[PDB]
Design an enzyme around this catalytic site. Structure first.
Site, mmCIF file in Angstrom:
data_model
loop_
_atom_site.group_PDB
_atom_site.id
_atom_site.type_symbol
_atom_site.label_atom_id
_atom_site.label_comp_id
_atom_site.label_asym_id
_atom_site.label_seq_id
_atom_site.Cartn_x
_atom_site.Cartn_y
_atom_site.Cartn_z
ATOM 1 N N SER A 71 0.869 -1.188 0.000
ATOM 2 C CA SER A 71 0.000 0.000 0.000
ATOM 3 C C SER A 71 0.907 1.240 0.000
ATOM 4 O O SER A 71 1.680 1.387 -0.983
ATOM 5 C CB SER A 71 -0.977 -0.065 1.145
ATOM 6 O OG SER A 71 -2.104 0.768 0.891
ATOM 7 N N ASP B 171 -9.839 -4.860 -3.959
ATOM 8 C CA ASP B 171 -9.260 -3.818 -3.081
ATOM 9 C C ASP B 171 -10.214 -2.620 -3.046
ATOM 10 O O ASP B 171 -10.478 -2.046 -4.125
ATOM 11 C CB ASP B 171 -7.882 -3.403 -3.605
ATOM 12 C CG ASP B 171 -7.013 -2.701 -2.595
ATOM 13 O OD1 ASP B 171 -7.579 -1.906 -1.769
ATOM 14 O OD2 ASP B 171 -5.756 -2.984 -2.605
ATOM 15 N N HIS C 52 -7.622 -5.864 0.065
ATOM 16 C CA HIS C 52 -6.410 -5.015 0.180
ATOM 17 C C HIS C 52 -5.234 -5.804 0.765
ATOM 18 O O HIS C 52 -4.078 -5.447 0.441
ATOM 19 C CB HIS C 52 -6.747 -3.751 0.965
ATOM 20 C CG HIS C 52 -5.644 -2.745 0.978
ATOM 21 N ND1 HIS C 52 -5.037 -2.287 -0.193
ATOM 22 C CD2 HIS C 52 -5.039 -2.116 2.012
ATOM 23 C CE1 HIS C 52 -4.131 -1.382 0.120
ATOM 24 N NE2 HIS C 52 -4.093 -1.267 1.490
#
Length: 262
Positions: free
Chosen positions: A131, A177, A208
Site C-alpha cells: 500500500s 481492493d 487489500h
C-alpha cells in the site's frame, strides 16, 4: 554479469513454503533512519546475496509483510522488514526509511559482529512493500535506478505517474481492493511505466491484504516474488520463464507483462 545461486528451479521448488537455504534472523539493535527492523538471511547460500527492504502500509507493522522474510531469504537474499518511525508516515517518508534500511544492511555487511558480515552483495538491491509502503517502493525505484527490482503489493501513491521508472517492477494487485482500488491505483501505476521490464498480477477476489502474512495464495505469490527477484536481482536467466510467464491459475483475475522475455 550473472550471480546464479542454488539449484535449477522448478514450479514445485518455487511454490514450496521454503527454498533450498536455511534461514536465521535477528532484530536490528540501533535502527538508523527507520523505526525497527528484522533481518532474515541464508546461513548457506554459498555466495554473497542481494538485499531486499520491505515496508508496511499505513498503521501497519512488520507482521503484515513478515512472511516475505523467510520465503525470499530461503532462496538466497538478505531481507529486512521494517517498522516506520511512525505508523502514520506517508509514501515519501516510507521510501527514505526503506533506503535507510538498505543502507544499514550494507553497514552490517561490513560489521564483524553482525550475523550478515560478508553475506551481502551491496551492489544488488531490491524494494518491496504494501500500500503506502508499495508507493514508497516505486518512489525508491524512481529515485534510485540502480535498484535491480521492485515488487510492491496493492500499491498506493498520491500520484500514479511512475513514467521515469527503469527498474524491473512486479505489481501485486488485489481484484476487490476497496482501500487502494486497482482501477485508480495499481493499474494506472502499472500503465505509467513505459521504460522497464514490468508485470501486473491481480489476485482473484483479493481484498487489500491479499499478499500479506496469512494470505491463502503463498504458493503462487511466493513463486512469482522469488522468480522476479532471482531473475532481475541475480540476472539469473534460469528464472526468465517463471518471472515472465502467465502462471495460468484460476487465482489470477488479471495478468499483464512487458519487456519480459521467456
Amino acid at each position: 554479469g550473472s550471480h546464479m545461486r542454488g539449484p535449477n528451479p522448478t514450479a514445485a521448488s518455487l511454490e514450496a513454503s521454503a527454498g533450498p537455504f536455511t534461514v536465521r534472523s535477528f532484530t536490528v539493535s540501533r535502527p538508523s533512519g527507520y523505526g525497527a527492523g528484522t533481518v532474515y538471511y541464508p546461513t548457506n547460500a554459498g555466495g554473497t546475496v542481494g538485499a531486499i527492504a520491505i515496508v508496511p502500509g499505513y498503521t501497519a507493522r512488520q507482521s503484515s509483510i513478515k512472511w516475505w522474510g523467510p520465503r525470499l531469504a530461503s532462496h538466497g537474499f538478505v531481507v529486512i522488514t521494517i517498522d516506520t518511525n511512525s505508523t502514520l508516515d506517508q509514501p515519501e517518508s516510507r521510501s527514505s526509511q526503506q533506503m535507510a534500511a538498505l543502507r544499514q544492511v550494507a553497514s552490517l555487511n561490513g560489521t564483524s559482529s553482525s550475523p550478515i558480515y560478508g553475506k551481502v552483495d551491496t551492489a544488488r538491491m531490491g524494494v518491496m512493500g504494501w500500500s503506502m509502503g508499495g508507493g514508497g517502493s516505486l518512489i525508491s525505484a524512481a529515485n534510485n535506478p540502480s535498484l535491480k527490482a521492485a515488487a510492491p503489493q496493492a500499491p498506493w501513491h498520491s500520484s500514479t505517474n511512475f513514467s521515469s521508472v527503469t527498474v524491473p517492477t512486479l505489481i501485486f494487485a488485489c481484484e476487490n481492493d476497496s482501500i487502494a482500488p486497482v482501477n485508480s491505483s495499481a493499474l494506472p501505476i502499472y500503465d505509467s511505466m513505459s521504460r522497464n521490464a514490468k508485470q501486473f498480477l491481480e489476485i482473484n477476489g483479493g481484498s487489500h491484504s491479499c499478499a500479506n502474512t496469512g494470505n491463502s495464495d503463498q504458493a503462487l505469490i511466493g513463486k512469482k516474488g522469488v522468480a522476479w527477484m532471482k531473475r532481475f536481482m541475480d540476472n539469473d536467466t534460469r528464472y526468465s520463464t517463471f518471472a515472465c510467464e502467465n502462471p495460468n491459475s484460476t487465482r489470477v483475475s488479471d495478468f499483464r507483462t512487458a519487456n519480459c522475455s521467456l
